[PDB]
Amino acid sequence: GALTESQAALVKSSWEEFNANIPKHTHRFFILVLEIAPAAKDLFSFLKGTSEVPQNNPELQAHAGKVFKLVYEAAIQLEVTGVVVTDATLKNLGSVHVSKGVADAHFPVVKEAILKTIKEVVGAKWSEELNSAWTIAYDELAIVIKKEMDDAA
């Protein structure tokens, strides 16, 4: 619907299972990115010039870890305040995605890699409720980001 408290708890929980194994789950996420769009390898500074996705790289891990934490924090905010707030950070995030060559058409790629990562994290605990929770938070955060992108390009 638009982030009920039970949806918000499901996101927080799954997020906590994600961050219990950062090395594994962030390796997995980038595999799921290149399986959807092999061309995306080149947008990524620590992926470029590699064969396979590094398994123990700190920059890959800190990056993929901020990405997930931002969606999870958008979902708590949609559930608390009813919106995703535009702040320094997300306007900065609009400029950086612009610099790197990210386009609007790119956003569904990262969406499907997050949904698929999360389904492998929770395993048997996966639900349609959890899936649709992650979907709303992502899509609400991509709107605000794309907005910030667009003002500059």
Binding site for ligand HEM (CB under 6 A): 40, 43-45, 63, 66-67, 70-71, 93, 96-97, 100, 102, 106-107, 109-110, 138, 141-142, 145
CB of 84 to ligand HEM, least distance (A): 10
14 is in an annotated binding site: no
CB of 58 to ligand HEM, least distance (A): 12
Instruction: Identify which of residues 136 and 142 has a Cβ nearer to ligand HEM in the complex.
Output: 142
Nearer to ligand HEM, 9 or 109 (CB): 109
The nearest distance, CB 124 to ligand HEM, in angstroms, is 27
Residue 45 labeled ligand binder: yes
Angstrom distance (rounded) from CA 17 to CA 123: 10
Give the nearer residue to ligand HEM in terms of CB position, either 70 or 130: 70
- Report phi then psi at 101, rounded to 5: 90, 30
The answer to whether 30 and 60 have CB atoms below 8 angstroms apart is: yes
**Nearest CA-CA partner of 19 in 55, 72, 57:** 72
Q: Which is nearer to ligand HEM, 25 or 97 (CB)?
A: 97
Tell the smallest beta-carbon distance from residue 142 to ligand HEM (Å): 5
- Taking a C-beta distance cutoff of 8 angstroms, is the pair 18, 56 a contact? no
> Residues annotated in the binding site for O2, as ranges?
63
